[PDB]
C-alpha cells in the first residue's frame, strides 16, 4: 500500500530569478495532476500588487500623443506594466512623478510614498526632449492573480486618467514537463519538472512554498468530510 | 503541421475576442489567453526582449528617434499574434523572427534554411520542439470530422 | 453505411473482417447489416437444435432437448479446443430450463457470437481528434479499461507433439528420469514424465520428458577429468526432451498420449506420440494491431489509464482515440455515419406525433420508439438517410439530468482527462465497432 | 549521455573528412579496447585513456571524447 | 484584492452519488481543482478484491464445472466484478459453496467476520439439479488494478487460480464550474464535483482519501522547502 519511493522536491538554480524544480521518482498517473494544480495556483493563488491606472498631465484619453516626450503613450503603459510594485495598504494608493528638463527619467527617480516599495528602479521609462515636462501620478493597488484592464469611469472622474492592466502574480511563467523514470524495474514513475520564472521582488521557491501551503490548505478542507488513511512513506 | 499551421494563423479562426491590445510581454499575453480574455487567433502588440531577432522585413523600418538605434538586436514591439510568438521561440534565439502562416512549404523553407545555417544538435533540437509543440496544439486545435 | 465508402477501402475492410479473433465475451454490432444473423446461423459455429421440444438438462459439457414425439437428443457443446489458426472456439450456452424451441433455433453460441448474431468484436465509445502524437499516422489509443475489464481479450490455444520414435541404436523412452537436470525442473511432471493439467509454463519449462536410447560417446579430455573429480557418470543416454519453444507463456489444459502396445494404431516406428495444449489469455496490450469495420486499421501505440482519458460532460470517459487526418484522405466517411448511429442506438429515442418528414418514415418504418441500448440495423444500401441521422439526433433521449450530451451537429463537450480544461470546441463522439 | 553528446562538427573539421573521421576514431578505440583487455601484460607501446572514464564506458565513446578534445593527433603513412 | 477563502459543502443526490460545491475558487481554478481531484478519486482509494480462488476438480480456468452452465472463465468474469470491503490488511479466504439447482448469488457466499460482500443481488452461475459448486476466495486490499500475473505466487497448488482485480470503489465522477454572484471583474467560478461510487463505500470517504492523498503530497512539496 505505501508508495514504494517517497518524492522529494529539489531545485535547481541556473538564475537569481529563473528557477527549476524537479520531483523525484512519483506513483504513475500522479504527475500531471500536481504538475498542472501547481502551475495554475503559482500563476494565480499567490498574491501581489501592481499598478491599475495612469494618469498623465495635460493629456485626453483620446489624445494619445504627449507633449514634451518623444516616446507615445501606449509604450509607456507596456513600461509602467512592465514596472513591479511591493504594496500593502489593501486600498488604492496613488504614486507621484515629476520631472522636467531634457534626460531620461526612470524608475528610480520616482519618488515612492511611504509603505510602498519599488524592488527595480532601474527600468527607464521615458525619454524627454527639450523641456521634460512630465508629471504623471499611478495608482496603485493590491491583487490577486490577473485582471484585465476595464472602466471604472476614472476617465470620466477625470480625463488624463486611463486604466490598465495589471500583473498581480509575482510570477511570469510556469512551463511544466512530465517524463518517465525507472525505479526497481519498474518504468511506471513519472518524474515532474517545473519551471518558474518569476519577477526580482519575489525568489521563485518561496512563491512555490506558499502555493503548496494554499493547495494543502485547499484540499485539506475536504478532510471535514471523515477522517481516513491512506499508505504513505 | 496541423498543429503549427493551428499556432500561427490569421484572424476569423475563432471570435478574436480581446483583439487590438498590446502586452507587455509574452509571458502576460499567456497570462492574458489562459485568463480567456485573449484567444491564440488574434491580432496584438507583443514586445521582445533584447537578443530577439527581429522579422527580415522589420530591419529597415525601426523606432523614431531623433538619436541612433539599432532595433536588430535589441527590444521592438510587434503587431502579430500569440502563436507567432509561441512559434519563433520554439526556434532558437538567433533564427530571425517569422511573422507568416508556416503551413506546410514555409516550415519545409525554414527547416531547410535551419539546416543549411545551424549545427546538427541545433537543428535536432529545434525540430523535437516543433514536433512537440505541433503534437501539442493539434490535440488543442480541434479538428474533428462529423 | 457502405455507401459511404471509397471502394478501396470497403475492399480493405471485407478482408480485414476476416481475421477478428474470438473474444472472451462476445457482444453483438449495435449498429450493422441486418444480416449478421444468416451468416452466423448459416455458418457451421452455432449449435441449433433439430427438433421442436423442450430443454430438460442446460450445462455447460452439453445441452439435452426432447421433442414431443419422444426422442432425446443431446447436443455436445466443443469447450476450449483449438482450432485451425490456434484459437478458442468456445461455445456458450443461451436457452433456459424450460423454454420452448423450434427447429433451427440457437441453442449455443460459437466462437465471435451473441444470441446467434456474429460478433467480431467489441464495440467502444471513440472520440476523434489527435492526442499528443500517440494517435500518429493512424496509431490507436485505447484506454486500460479495455485492458483492466477484459473487453478485448482472447484465448490463444498452442499445439506442440513428439514423438517416441524407435531408432537404430534402440528406443527413445518418455520418462521423468531425464538426465543430467536438475531435481527442480522435473518437478510438475507426471509418473510418466508428462507435464501435469493446469500447470503454469514458461520458455525453458518441460512438457514432457524423452531421453535418446544412447549414442557412441568418446569422452573428451575435459570431460573426463571434470567427471572424474565429481565422481559424475556420463551416460550413453541422451536428454531429447520436449521444451516450450523461447518466448512463450500459458497454463495446460489437456494432454493426450497414443501408445503402440496399445490398441491405438500410429504410424511405422513411432512407439508413442504425446500432444500438449497450452492455453493463455491474451489481454489487448501495445502493438497488437487493430481495426474497424471501414478499413481503418492501426496498432494500438499507448494505453493510458481510464483518467487520463478526454471524458464526457456526465464523466463517462472515451474508450478509443482515433485520429481525424484518416477519414478525409482515406475517403471513407462511413465510419463516422456508423459512429454517429452508435451513439444514437446507445440513447435511445422518442419520435412520436413530430410531424417531420424523417419522422413520417420512421413512424411507418415502426423505428419510432426505440429504448437505450438496443441494437440498430441499417443494410448495407437502404442504410439510415442523413436526414434520419440528424433529426434523431435532435431527439436523443436525455440520459440525465434531462440534458443532451450530443449537440445537434454530432459533437460533444470533451474535458482533457489530464490538464482538466476543456477542449476549446466540440468533438465527434459515440460508438463504433472495432476489430 | 548520449550518441550525440560529441557533437559531430567539431569533429569534422578537426580531421576535415567524415569518413577519415570513423576510421581514425576506430583505430583508437580498438587502441583503447586492447588497452583495456591487458589483463597483466603491460605493454609499453598501449595507450590507455588520456580523457576521464567511468567504472563501466564504450571504447568509441571515449574515442569520440578523445578526438574532440583535440589532444589526439594522426598521421597518414 | 478581496480575500475569501475556499469552503466545500456537501449535498446528497442518492444513497451511493453525491455532489460537492466550492464556490469562492479563483478564476481559472475550477477546472484544474475538479481534474486533480478526479484523477486521484479514480486512480487510487483503499478496496478489496479477490485476488484468487480454488475450485476443487478444477486445476485451471480453461476447464468447465460440470452443473453450470456458464465455463469457468465466465465464473472469474463473473467475479471479477464482485465487490467487497476487507478490513483485514493481510488475505482472507471466503468459502462458496451451493447445491443442487438454483442460482447462485453473491448473498450465498459465506462472509468472514470482517468481510463483506455489498452487492447480495449478483448472479454469479446457474446450477442444475445434478450440479455441484463448491468455491475458495481469497480477498486482498489495496489500490487501482493490478493484473493477475503479478497475483500468482503460489505454484505447488495447481488448484489456486488467480483472478486479475479492480480495487476502486468509485464509478466515475464529473466536475463543473459557474461563475459566482460577486460583483467583481474577477469572477469567482464555483466548482461543483458530481462523485458516484459503488456499493464498497460512501463517496464522503472516498473523496476523503482522496484529500488525504493530495495534501500528503502538497504538503511535502510545502516542507521541503523553505
New interface residues.
Given amino acids: 500500500?505505501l508508495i514504494a519511493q517517497?518524492?522529494?522536491?529539489?531545485?535547481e538554480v541556473v538564475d537569481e530569478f529563473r528557477s527549476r524544480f524537479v520531483?523525484e521518482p512519483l506513483?504513475?498517473?500522479?504527475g500531471?495532476?500536481?504538475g498542472?494544480?501547481?502551475r495554475?495556483?503559482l500563476?494565480?493563488?499567490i498574491?501581489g500588487a501592481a499598478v491599475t491606472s495612469i494618469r498623465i498631465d495635460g493629456v485626453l484619453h483620446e489624445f494619445t500623443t504627449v507633449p514634451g516626450v518623444?516616446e507615445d503613450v501606449?509604450?509607456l503603459?507596456?513600461?509602467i506594466?512592465?514596472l513591479v510594485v511591493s504594496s500593502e495598504h489593501?486600498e488604492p494608493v496613488v504614486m507621484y512623478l515629476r520631472k522636467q528638463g531634457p534626460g531620461l527619467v526612470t524608475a528610480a527617480d520616482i519618488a515612492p510614498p511611504a509603505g510602498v516599495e519599488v524592488h527595480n528602479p532601474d527600468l527607464v521609462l521615458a525619454?524627454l526632449?527639450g523641456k521634460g515636462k512630465l508629471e504623471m501620478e499611478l495608482t496603485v493597488?493590491?491583487?490577486?492573480?490577473?485582471?484585465?484592464a476595464?472602466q471604472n469611469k476614472q476617465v470620466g472622474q477625470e480625463i488624463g486618467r486611463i486604466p490598465v492592466?495589471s500583473?498581480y502574480?509575482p510570477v511570469?511563467?510556469v512551463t511544466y514537463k512530465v517524463e518517465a523514470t525507472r525505479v526497481e524495474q519498474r518504468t511506471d514513475f513519472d518524474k515532474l519538472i517545473v519551471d518558474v520564472?518569476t519577477k526580482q521582488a519575489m525568489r521563485p521557491?518561496?512563491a512555490?512554498?506558499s502555493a503548496?501551503?494554499t493547495?494543502?490548505?485547499?484540499?485539506?478542507?475536504?478532510?471535514?468530510?471523515?477522517?481516513?488513511?491512506?499508505?504513505?512513506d | 503541421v496541423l498543429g503549427l499551421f493551428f499556432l500561427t494563423t490569421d484572424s476569423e479562426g475563432r471570435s478574436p475576442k480581446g483583439e487590438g491590445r498590446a502586452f507587455g510581454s509574452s509571458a502576460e499575453a499567456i497570462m492574458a489567453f489562459d485568463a480567456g480574455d485573449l484567444t491564440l487567433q488574434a491580432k496584438i502588440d507583443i514586445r521582445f526582449p533584447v537578443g530577439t531577432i527581429p522579422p527580415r522585413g522589420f530591419e529597415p523600418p525601426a523606432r523614431e528617434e531623433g538619436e541612433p538605434e539599432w532595433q536588430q538586436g535589441d527590444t521592438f514591439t510587434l503587431k502579430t499574434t500569440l502563436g507567432r510568438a509561441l512559434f519563433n521561440e520554439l526556434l532558437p534565439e538567433d533564427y530571425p523572427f517569422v511573422d507568416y502562416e508556416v503551413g506546410k512549404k514555409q516550415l519545409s523553407e525554414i527547416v531547410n534554411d535551419l539546416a543549411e545555417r545551424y549545427p546538427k544538435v541545433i537543428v535536432a533540437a529545434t525540430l523535437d520542439n516543433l514536433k512537440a509543440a505541433g503534437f501539442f496544439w493539434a490535440t488543442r486545435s480541434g479538428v474533428t470530422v462529423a | 453505411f457502405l455507401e459511404h465508402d471509397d471502394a478501396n477501402r470497403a475492399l480493405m475492410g471485407a478482408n480485414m473482417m476476416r481475421q477478428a479473433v474470438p473474444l472472451i465475451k462476445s457482444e453483438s454490432p449495435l449498429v450493422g447489416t441486418g444480416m449478421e444473423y444468416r451468416s452466423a446461423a448459416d455458418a457451421g459455429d452455432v449449435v441449433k437444435a433439430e427438433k421442436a421440444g423442450v430443454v430438460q438438462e442446460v450445462s455447460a459439457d452439453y445441452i439435452t432437448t426432447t421433442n414431443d414425439d419422444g426422442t432425446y437428443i443431446t447436443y455436445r457443446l466443443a469447450k476450449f479446443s483449438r482450432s485451425n489458426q490456434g484459437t478458442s472456439v468456445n461455445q456458450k450456452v443461451i436457452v433456459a430450463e424450460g423454454d420452448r424451441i423450434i427447429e433451427g433455433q440457437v441453442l449455443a453460441d460459437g466462437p465471435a457470437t451473441e444470441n446467434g448474431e456474429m460478433a467480431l468484436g467489441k464495440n467502444l465509445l471513440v472520440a476523434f481528434m489527435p492526442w499528443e502524437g500517440h494517435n500518429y499516422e493512424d496509431a490507436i489509443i485505447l484506454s486500460q479499461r479495455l485492458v483492466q475489464d477484459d473487453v478485448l481479450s482472447s484465448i490463444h490455444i498452442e499445439e506442440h507433439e513428439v514423438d517416441a520414435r524407435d531408432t537404430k541404436l534402440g528406443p527413445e523412452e518418455i520418462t521423468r528420469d531425464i538426465p543430467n537436470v536438475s531435481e527442480e525442473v522435473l518437478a510438475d511432471l507426471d509418473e510418466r514424465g508428462i507435464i501435469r493439467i493446469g500447470a503454469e509454463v514458461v520458455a525453458g519449462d518441460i512438457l514432457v520428458g524423452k531421453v535418446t536410447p544412447k549414442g557412441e560417446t568418446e569422452l573428451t579430455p575435459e570431460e573426463r577429468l571434470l567427471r572424474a573429480i565429481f565422481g559424475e557418470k556420463a551416460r550413453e543416454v541422451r536428454d531429447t526432451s520436449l521444451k516450450v519453444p523461447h518466448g512463450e507463456i500459458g497454463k495446460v489444459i489437456g494432454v493426450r498420449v497414443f501408445d503402440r502396445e496399445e490398441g491405438d494404431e500410429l504410424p511405422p516406428g513411432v512407439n508413442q506420440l504425446v500432444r500438449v495444449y497450452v492455453a493463455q489469455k491474451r489481454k489487448i496490450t501495445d502493438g497488437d494491431k487493430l481495426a474497424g469495420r471501414h478499413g481503418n486499421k492501426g496498432v494500438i501505440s499507448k494505453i493510458n489509464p481510464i483518467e487520463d482519458m478526454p471524458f464526457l460532460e456526465d464523466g463517462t470517459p472515451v474508450d478509443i482515440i482515433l485520429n481525424p487526418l484518416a477519414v478525409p484522405s482515406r475517403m471513407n466517411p462511413g465510419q463516422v455515419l456508423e459512429i454517429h448511429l452508435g451513439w444514437l442506438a446507445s440513447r435511445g429515442w422518442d419520435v412520436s406525433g413530430l410531424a417531420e418528414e424523417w419522422a413520417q418514415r420512421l413512424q411507418v418504418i415502426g423505428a419510432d420508439k426505440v429504448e437505450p441500448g438496443t441494437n440498430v440495423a441499417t443494410p448495407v444500401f437502404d442504410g439510415a438517410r442523413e436526414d434520419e441521422l440528424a433529426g434523431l439526433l435532435q431527439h436523443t433521449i436525455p440520459n440525465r439530468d434531462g440534458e443532451r450530451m450530443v449537440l445537434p451537429s454530432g459533437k460533444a463537450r470533451l474535458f482533457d482527462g489530464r490538464s482538466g480544461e476543456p477542449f476549446p470546441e466540440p468533438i465527434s463522439v459515440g460508438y463504433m465497432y472495432i476489430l | 549521455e548520449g550518441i550525440i553528446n560529441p557533437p559531430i562538427d567539431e569533429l569534422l573539421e578537426a580531421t576535415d573528412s567524415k569518413y577519415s573521421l570513423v576510421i581514425y576514431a576506430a583505430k583508437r578505440a580498438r587502441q583503447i579496447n586492447a588497452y583495456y583487455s591487458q589483463l597483466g601484460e603491460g605493454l609499453l607501446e598501449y595507450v590507455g585513456p588520456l580523457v576521464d572514464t567511468h567504472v563501466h564506458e564504450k571504447p568509441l565513446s571515449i574515442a569520440l571524447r578523445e578526438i574532440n578534445a583535440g589532444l589526439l593527433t594522426s598521421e597518414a603513412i
Fill in positions: 500500500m517517497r518524492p522529494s522536491l529539489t531545485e520531483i506513483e504513475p498517473g500522479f500531471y495532476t500536481l498542472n494544480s501547481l495554475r495556483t500563476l494565480s493563488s498574491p518623444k501606449t509604450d503603459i507596456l513600461n506594466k512592465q489593501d525619454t526632449n493597488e493590491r491583487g490577486r492573480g490577473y485582471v484585465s476595464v492592466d500583473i502574480s511570469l511563467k520564472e521557491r518561496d512555490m512554498a503548496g501551503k493547495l494543502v490548505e485547499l484540499f485539506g478542507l475536504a478532510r471535514e468530510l471523515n477522517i481516513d488513511a491512506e499508505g504513505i
